[PDB]
Each structure stands twice: as structure tokens, then as C-alpha cells.
């Protein structure tokens, strides 16, 4: 399925010029990337300081590396917006594992229910799952990792004080409380031999699961509709935890960090924001916030194009004597749009013509379509290039010359040519003298299941610590 | 993305029995396959005889193998039901090629237009394409391969007497005539420096393009909504062409054969048809016809399931007190249904529950769903197993111990686990003592572009013959 020649020899000078103007706006220089990486490390350090920063840099309370020799049965719970997964993970102690999965739909009414309703429903699903796979009981309570990818703060791993709800949830009573004991007493009432040892964020889980199978993993990243990264740091580097750690957690113990860097540069000092980005920010549900995410997330790529085109329409360059109505409404163009445009294998760009005609009732000319394809390539390329800046920041802060980056999320998994973009971008930073992307010192690999397999391995490492009498949080709970 | 455990320990004895009854109906034995392959060769021989057979075995008039050292610029035209492709193929003489593609939508009105309307529209697209890539003209008329995947008979390659229209076309004047001169005089009127040298069927093109890149290709197969196979035979084996070939086409010259074996066993003597197949045949647009296709095509897999379930519903086994309305209408379940059911990674089979609930308003129990999954696996497995019977027939007729089979079509490309099924099936026939499917003597590989790149390479081989003064059909045209 080859790439198109993409000739521009028929494009009128007036558009040819507007295209050049857009390349000026959406190109990120090798040196411009290096300046953002420089400031990124500074903001990473600040997040780990006593003062506080804009990147939260939340400790995940995983204090060991998975050796790959861990064995046993462990449960994982993944709570999404619309449904939960229950995963039984069998660790075979050879960088291998076996999974058994159920998925239960959340009744749409539970999103607005109470505390009791939500937790008892999870409990019922859990009992039902356990009675199927352990119909004769267990010799020992099964440890469970709980993926709760929500704004929460942990003073210890078996805890999760919820700051605020997200993704359409609106349950009262839970906001401002530790959610683990609320789940636990619901598990206990149905007399289920499981035990909630750990509550994690999916990115921490992406880091830990991938490290279990791939010993060269130094970072777990998510590029989807949301954006996040997680890496192992050192305790002696975390200034905000000084004098709060117990004696058994030494200065040379590694600490897993849930960065939550989607908020990098909310101050707007480094990131090359265009007037199109500024409108997206000002019209967002939460203006002034999530600056790095809006620049990198896949959710916004289609919206950028919409405004760019709309701006060119007003200047009378494109879609002359056409019905623009549908292009006027916000977020009508999702990620699928630039996705499909970049995939278009034809010179006349017929897939793009079929898209705009069928979905948006706009009839395009070949030259307009060629401009549209250039737009999508640029927008996609900028995103990938601004993303790797975070990979480079974390690798430079910790002194990783060689790294495997575990990657997940719709944009990494499905956005056309994204891996080739990201690789070329990393090459543009470090200036590697290598011909093949396979031989790159730092590269992106497909992550293992973070919210399932990941939460289980964390349950393993925590049960390992609790059984021996080791600490898993700050002193005095 | 692992496979589910698939426990049946909770399934009531009454269903457990109905499942066993279905396995009896849809299983094809190793020996039962071998008996069909035996009869298949017999029917293949018959199609090449003077008498005639049920498998048409149409000569494709390609009389050479692509060496992989062919060079030059060649055009390809692919006429589909809804749109045409125009492909420029640059042969680099090293099992390599470069493509440049346009795709033009057919105006829906042209399907019911006249002869002049259709051919002049193709001509306009062709001129427009040529004026873009050769804006200064050419030193020599460009040869063009024409993919016309329609019921037609060729007495020579640069000809195509159309038997009957298909895929929604209804143009008058074309049916019963040679279509090449009709296209040619339209090309000539617009003064386009192209020359129609060859008209092919896409399966012949799948064979020839794949052989150009992979020297081990012995067969080209299509498993999609339609079914077809093509291989190279020997002229001394074709009894129905004896005394019709010119002197330069010797008894040791290879001949490409468009099998069209979708009609294998319309007599119903060998193929293990159930009562569900019989209803599909009797309610089809063309009853009694395309017997092997109905048993193998992906278009019918969803319909089989529908009738099986509907039959179990009447016997009061499943969907008790449910709204069956939507399941009563024909062809409501397409290939996506068994496709998605087999892909379901969950033990409780939630993707299947979401499918039947959302699309069909049917609420299923776990046990019903487990029966449904067993059904889809069986139906899919039978199809794959009946398909390879044709691969084995062709390989045994020609004495291929080692073969690469070039495969294309939605079922091969997208049906979950289809390659693993087909491989296991071929192993069941020849009883190979090999552990890995990668080391199998006969195996299926992804075909190259048959209707585009394929038609171009055939244009090359035909221009090679015409320029030297060699024959490309029966004597006296």
C-alpha cells in the first residue's frame, strides 16, 4: 500500500503561497525542540520539589523493578467510563503471563448513582468472576490491583483520595475520600476472598507491565485522547518526600512517577502555539489548562484543521460558492479525518474527496484537496514532534542513552505513519548517525496491557512487600 | 490480544447436546477433504476437455512466466462496480515496481447508460491522467492492461466478448460484443497515446503480479465475497485448444488458466451441504448455481448462522421470551458478525452481547453466547477447510510439492484467524511432520495487487510478444 507521489505542479501560486505560510506555522525546528526539552527537564525537576510545580509528578509507590521471575495468581480491576474489566493474571516467572478476562458494561444510571450503588456493583461482578474460576475457594485471599485512572492523590499505594471526577462520572460522596476502603467493605460484605492491595494509574501500569516482559523499558507513555508519561526515578531525587519516607525505603530505592505532564507549559512560555491553538484553548471546557495535552492529544487534530480551513474560507481562497454550514460546528472533524487524509493512496486524492463530499457536503477541487493533505501531514507531524520532546526530557534527566519506550493509545496504535514520524523526530534531536530506525538508541515499542496485566504485577510487588513487613507509603499512613 | 479459555462447564446438558449435533454437521474430516480433492482434480481435467465441464477453466492467454527482469512503463485499468482505478506501473527489472494511482468514482447514472457514455467517460479519465504524468507526450504509445472481472470469453488476450453483466451494471449494446474495440475507438477519438493490448480477470492478475515478485508462486486465489483461482498449466494438457493454437505456441508453452471454479459441484455429489446450505441455495438469486462459492464465500457466513439460530429458536432452545423480529429478515447478519464473535477476547463474551443487543435487540445469556461463539468458529472453519481443497486440487494436478499461494480478498485479509485455519487444514490433508506453519511445504502468502500491477505486467508480456511478431490467441483471430 505505497505512498503517493504528491505533485504540486498544478497548484495556483495564490494557494502555493498559503501552503508555505502554513509550513512556517506548523514546523518545529530541531533546535526549537531542543529548547523545549531543556525547559521540560526544568519543569520536571520543579514538580518533584517541596515548592511544587505545574507538572504534578505523582509518586506511584512502586519501589522495585519487576525482575521477570515473579510467579502467582493476581487480580486486576480496570474501571473505565462506560465499563469495567476483571483480569486474572497468571505470572509464569519467565517474562511471561496468562490472562483470563471478563468485561462488564456499566449501567448508564450508575454514573449518576450513589457511593453504595457503584461499589456493590463492582463487588457483584467480582464475586461472579471468582465463583467461576475458583468454584471451590482459595487457600489465600487473592491480591488485586485496581486501575483507577482519575485525578487522585496517594500517600500510600493501597489508598486513593479522589480529588475530582472525570469522563462523565457524577457520583456524590466519593469525591474527597479514599476509595479503597469503600470498595473493600463492599467486597467483605459479599464475603469474597480478594484483597485490595494497590490502586494505580494506567500509565504507571503501562510502565510496569512492559518492564516485566521487556527489561529495556525505561518509560511508559500514552498518546491517545489523553496524554501521559511514567518513568522510574530515584528517591534521593524527590525533594518533596524528604523526611516522610520510612527507614526501609532507602535513598537508592527507585520510585515510579506518574508525571501527568499534560499540563506542561500552562504558563505559555515555550510551546509554539498558533492562533488556531489559542481559539481551541479559549473555547475548551477548561481554558488555560492542559496546555501540553491540547498540543499533543489526538482529540484535537481534527479541530485544528477545521479552524484553519474556516480561516482560509473567509479569506476567499477555498470552497468558493460552497455550503460551509457543517464546517461551522465545533468538533465535527475528529481524529479519523486527518487519519484518512494521510492514508489516501491516490494522486487525485479520491478518498479525501469522498470524505468531504459524503460527510461534509463540500465539493473540493484537486488543488484544494492537495492543500488539505499538506495540512493534515503538518498537523500530525507537529503533534508527534511535540510528543517526543517529553520522551527526550525524561531520558535526558535520568541519563538514558539507550531506552525502550512502551507506548499505547489510539494515536500511537492507529494514526497513519505515527511511528515513522516519532522516530524521525527523535533522530532530529539527538542527531544519530544511523540509517535504520530499528537500530535507533532510543525507540518506541508497543506497550503491554497497562490497566490489566500492569495492575496485577503491581499487586504482586506490593504483596511481596506487605507479607515481609515492608513499607508502601509515607510514615504513619 | 490473547485467545479466550472458552469453558463450557456451565452449559446445560440440553444445549451441550445441540452443540455436539452442530459439530457433527460442520466438521470436515481429513479423509472427507481428500475425497473432495480427488473429485476436484477430475472436474478440473473435465473443464479443459473438448466435451466441456462445470468449471469453465478459461485460458487467460498469458503464455510466459514473468522473469522479474521486465522493465518499462505500463498502464493498468481496473473497472469495479462503483469506480475505476488508473495505475501507472514502472517495472524496475528487479522483482520491483513503482506505482502511481488515480481512482475515479463512476456516476451512478452510468450503470444504466449506453455504450458510448461508459467508454468515453473512461477515455476522459485516461486522457486527464496521461496529461498530468506525460504533459509533453510520449515517444511510444503506452501499453495498457485492462482488468475486466466480468463473465467474458477470450479467443485472444486483446479481446473480451462479454457474456453477461454483473455487480449492478445494466448497459445495453455491450452485452454480446467485444469490448476492447469499443474502448479503443473512444481512446482514439480523444487522441490518447495509449494502446489496449490486454484484457484480464483479476485472479489471473493476482497470479502474474505475485509471480513477478515471488518466484515460488504457483497459484493465485481470491477468497472474498466472490471465489476464484488461477494457475499456470501446460498447453499439451489443454484438450479443448488442440488444433487451434498457432505454430509459435508450442506444446511446452505454459498457459495461465482462469478457473472460475466457484461452480465446482453444482451437481451436488461431493460437497457436505446441510439443510441450512440448501435453504441458502433455494432462496438465492440464482438457485442451483455457484455451489462451491456458496460453501466458501465470506458473503454467506453470517446468513448460515442466522438460519441455524432461527432453527434453534423454533425448537425452543434459545432466546426464550425475546424479540426475534430482526433475525427473521434475510442477510441481516453479514460477515462482520462471525468476524466479531471470533475476535471476542472475553470469557463472558461481552462483545457478542453488545453486538446482539445493540444491532439485533436480542438479550443473550452467557450459555447462549457460548453456543453462538462455537457456531461462528465452526462455520468459519468449514469455509477455510473447503477452500484449501481447491489449493490442494491444483497443486496435486500439476505435481507441486512446494508452492506459494498468492491470496487476496476480504476473507483472507480480515477474517479472524483465517490463515491459521487454512494452514491447519492443508496440514490435515498432506499430513506434514512439521511443527511450525512457517516451514509448511505449501503455504499462503499475501498476494500483490492483481487488478492493477497485475494487469500492467500482463500488458508488458503481451507487448513483448506483439512487437516480435508472436501470437497471443487462436489462429485467424
Amino acid at each position: 500500500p505505497p505512498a503517493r507521489k504528491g505533485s504540486m505542479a498544478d497548484v495556483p501560486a495564490n494557494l502555493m503561497e498559503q501552503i508555505h505560510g502554513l509550513e512556517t506555522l506548523f514546523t518545529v525546528s530541531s533546535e526549537k525542540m531542543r529548547s523545549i526539552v531543556k525547559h521540560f527537564i526544568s519543569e520536571l525537576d520543579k514538580g518533584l520539589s517541596k515548592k511544587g510545580g505545574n507538572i504534578p509528578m505523582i509518586p506511584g509507590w512502586v519501589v522495585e523493578y519487576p525482575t521477570g521471575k515473579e510467579t502467582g495468581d493476581f487480580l486486576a480491576l480496570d474501571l473505565g467510563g462506560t465499563n469495567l474489566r476483571v483480569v486474572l493474571v497468571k505470572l509464569g516467572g519467565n517474562h511471561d503471563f496468562d490472562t483470563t478476562q471478563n468485561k462488564y458494561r456499566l449501567p448508564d444510571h450508575l454514573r449518576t448513582g450513589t457511593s453504595e450503588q457503584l461499589w456493590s456493583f463492582i463487588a457483584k461482578c467480582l464475586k461472579e468472576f471468582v465463583d467461576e474460576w475458583y468454584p471451590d475457594g482459595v487457600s489465600e485471599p487473592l491480591p488485586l490491583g485496581f486501575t483507577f485512572s482519575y485525578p487522585a492523590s496517594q500517600k500510600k499505594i493501597n489508598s486513593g483520595v479522589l480529588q475530582r471526577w472525570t469522563k462523565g462520572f457524577d457520583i456524590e460522596g466519593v469525591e474527597g475520600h479514599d476509595v479503597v476502603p469503600m470498595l473493600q467493605e463492599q467486597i467483605e460484605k459479599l464475603n469474597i476472598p480478594i484483597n485490595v492491595v494497590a490502586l494505580i494509574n494506567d500509565t504507571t501500569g503501562t510502565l510496569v507491565a512492559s518492564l516485566y516482559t521487556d527489561p529495556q523499558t525505561k518509560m511508559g507513555i500514552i498518546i491517545g485522547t489523553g496524554v501521559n508519561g511514567a518513568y522510574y526515578d530515584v528517591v534521593s531525587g524527590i525533594e518533596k518526600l524528604e523526611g516522610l519516607l520510612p527507614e526501609d525505603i532507602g535513598p537508592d530505592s527507585p520510585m515510579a512517577i506518574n508525571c501527568e505532564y499534560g499540563s506542561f507549559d500552562n504558563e505559555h512560555l515555550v510551546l509554539p502555539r498558533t492562533k488556531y491553538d489559542v481559539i481551541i484553548d479559549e473555547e475548551s471546557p477548561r481554558p488555560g489548562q492542559q496546555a501540553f495535552e491540547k498540543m499533543t492529544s489526538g482529540y484535537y487534530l481534527g479541530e485544528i484543521m477545521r479552524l484553519v480551513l474556516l480561516d482560509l474560507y473567509d479569506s476567499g481562497f477555498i470552497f468558493k460558492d460552497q455550503d460551509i454550514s457543517k464546517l461551522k460546528e465545533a468538533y465535527v472533524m475528529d481524529t479519523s479525518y486527518p487519519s484518512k487524509i494521510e492514508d489516501d493512496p491516490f494522486e487525485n486524492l479520491e478518498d479525501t474527496d469522498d470524505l468531504f463530499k459524503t460527510n461534509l457536503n463540500i465539493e473540493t477541487t484537486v488543488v484544494e484537496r492537495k492543500l488539505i493533505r499538506k495540512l493534515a501531514e503538518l498537523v500530525g507531524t507537529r503533534a508527534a514532534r511535540l510528543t517526543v520532546c517529553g520522551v527526550s526530557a525524561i531520558c535526558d534527566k535520568r541519563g538514558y542513552k539507550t531506552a525502550h519506550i512502551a507506548a499505547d493509545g489510539s494515536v500511537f496504535n492507529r494514526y497513519p505513519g505515527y511511528k515513522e514520524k516519532a522516530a524521525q523526530a527523535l533522530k532530529d534531536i539527538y542527531n544519530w548517525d544511523v540509517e535504520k530506525m530499528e537500530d535507533h538508541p532510543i525507540q518506541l515499542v508497543a506497550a503491554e496491557d497497562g490497566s490489566g496485566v500492569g495492575a496485577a504485577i503491581i499487586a504482586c510487588l506490593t504483596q511481596k512487600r506487605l507479607a515481609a513487613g515492608k513499607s508502601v507509603g509515607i510514615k504513619g499512613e
Side-chain angles (χ1 to χ4, degrees), chain A:
Chain A
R4 64 183 286 268
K5 298 283 178 291
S7 185
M8 304 253 64
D10 58 346
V11 185
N14 58 284
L15 288 177
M16 202 69 263
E17 213 164 46
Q18 292 293 307
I19 292 180
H20 281 129
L22 292 171
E23 286 185 309
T24 314
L25 260 60
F26 290 102
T27 300
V28 199
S29 332
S30 280
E31 73 158 313
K32 173 65 187 183
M33 287 177 82
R34 284 194 281 267
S35 73
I36 312 168
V37 171
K38 219 101 287 292
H39 192 269
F40 213 129
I41 300 167
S42 190
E43 280 271 67
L44 288 178
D45 273 350
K46 189 187 273 185
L48 305 159
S49 71
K50 286 275 192 192
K51 305 278 184 185
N54 229 335
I55 303 168
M57 304 290 288
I58 304 164
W61 300 106
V62 185
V63 294
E64 292 164 338
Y65 306 111
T67 62
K69 256 69 74 58
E70 291 82 16
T71 50
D73 294 11
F74 302 96
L75 293 181
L77 196 78
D78 171 32
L79 184 66
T82 48
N83 53 254
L84 52 38
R85 261 208 306 161
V86 187
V87 194
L88 173 66
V89 180
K90 263 84 95 74
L91 301 175
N94 215 108
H95 302 106
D96 63 338
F97 56 84
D98 180 271
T99 54
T100 299
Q101 287 164 44
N102 270 191
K103 179 181 150 208
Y104 311 80
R105 185 91 58 86
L106 272 158
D108 53 309
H109 91 100
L110 282 195
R111 298 152 193 174
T112 326
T114 58
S115 179
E116 201 206 78
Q117 307 270 25
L118 205 202
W119 303 123
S120 60
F121 174 86
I122 296 172
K124 283 175 194 174
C125 297
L126 280 166
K127 183 182 182 67
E128 207 204 58
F129 184 87
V130 167
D131 290 17
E132 215 214 329
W133 297 108
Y134 299 96
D136 304 293
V138 289
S139 61
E140 184 201 295
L142 294 157
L144 178 144
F146 179 24
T147 304
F148 192 73
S149 291
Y150 297 86
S153 60
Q154 308 161 252
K155 296 186 175 184
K156 56 172 183 179
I157 192 161
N158 46 338
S159 176
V161 178
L162 192 154
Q163 257 73 55
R164 188 199 51 198
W165 281 112
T166 202
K167 299 169 186 171
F169 279 103
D170 203 37
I171 294 98
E172 207 155 344
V174 179
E175 202 166 302
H177 280 109
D178 188 3
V179 307
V180 170
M182 295 199 295
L183 214 201
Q184 196 75 75
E185 85 153 347
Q186 277 309 320
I187 285 160
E188 260 280 293
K189 290 315 162 79
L190 280 314
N191 264 115
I192 307 160
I194 73 176
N195 220 73
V196 192
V197 282
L199 180 143
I200 67 155
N201 169 285
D202 64 345
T203 317
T204 317
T206 291
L207 169 67
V208 175
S210 304
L211 187 49
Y212 174 82
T213 53
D214 191 335
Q216 286 177 29
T217 313
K218 307 292 159 58
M219 185 183 164
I221 192 181
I222 304 291
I223 320 100
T225 84
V227 151
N228 200 10
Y231 73 110
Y232 276 100
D233 201 283
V234 71
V235 147
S236 65
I238 332 291
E239 197 189 31
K240 67 178 177 191
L241 289 172
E242 202 182 310
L244 291 176
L245 269 15
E247 294 177 343
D248 56 9
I249 305 168
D252 299 80
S253 86
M255 184 68 75
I257 304 300
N258 178 29
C259 293
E260 297 275 15
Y261 57 41
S263 63
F264 168 67
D265 196 51
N266 293 306
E267 308 157 80
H268 311 120
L269 303 167
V270 207
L271 290 175
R273 290 161 85 238
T274 67
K275 59 177 171 181
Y276 307 109
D277 302 288
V278 174
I279 296 165
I280 285 162
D281 195 302
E282 284 195 304
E283 295 196 311
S284 74
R286 203 156 144 256
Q289 307 290 132
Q290 299 300 114
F292 181 61
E293 197 174 71
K294 289 161 177 177
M295 295 296 285
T296 52
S297 164
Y299 184 82
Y300 298 99
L301 299 183
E303 179 66 3
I304 297 164
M305 287 187 73
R306 188 183 75 83
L307 293 180
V308 170
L309 294 179
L310 214 65
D311 195 18
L312 294 164
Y313 168 65
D314 296 12
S315 317
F317 283 111
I318 54 156
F319 307 149
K320 306 172 197 182
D321 286 28
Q322 282 289 320
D323 203 309
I324 257 65
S325 296
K326 296 198 80 70
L327 207 60
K328 279 179 180 173
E329 68 166 70
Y331 291 92
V332 68
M333 284 173 66
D334 58 301
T335 322
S336 65
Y337 282 77
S339 221
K340 288 185 186 180
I341 297 155
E342 285 210 51
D343 252 352
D344 202 328
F346 307 104
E347 304 302 331
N348 58 352
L349 288 167
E350 246 275 346
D351 283 4
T352 307
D353 193 12
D354 178 58
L355 221 204
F356 275 78
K357 199 169 171 68
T358 306
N359 281 3
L360 306 175
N361 280 49
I362 302 155
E363 307 195 78
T364 48
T365 62
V366 203
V367 299
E368 284 172 335
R369 224 139 55 218
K370 286 181 185 183
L371 176 146
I372 292 159
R373 160 62 90 98
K374 195 88 221 78
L375 219 209
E377 287 174 357
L378 285 161
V379 176
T381 297
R382 193 186 60 165
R385 282 171 82 82
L386 289 180
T387 297
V388 284
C389 281
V391 164
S392 188
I394 282 159
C395 284
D396 280 17
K397 188 208 179 302
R398 301 282 294 108
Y400 303 144
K401 310 279 281 174
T402 298
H404 270 202
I405 313 298
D408 207 349
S410 52
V411 175
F412 178 80
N413 294 328
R414 262 105 73 198
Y415 195 93
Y418 191 91
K419 300 155 162 64
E420 284 81 17
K421 288 164 161 78
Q424 225 301 130
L426 278 171
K427 194 181 181 175
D428 281 7
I429 287 108
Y430 294 96
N431 221 231
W432 296 310
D433 190 38
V434 175
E435 293 178 38
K436 302 168 187 184
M437 65 176 284
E438 318 193 316
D439 300 328
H440 281 206
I442 299 158
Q443 50 184 289
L444 281 75
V445 294
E448 292 279 9
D449 176 38
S451 67
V453 180
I457 298 157
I458 305 198
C460 176
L461 300 185
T462 311
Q463 182 55 51
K464 185 159 138 62
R465 281 186 74 86
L466 285 163
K470 299 266 193 65
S471 306
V472 281
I474 66 156
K475 59 184 178 74
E477 177 208 10

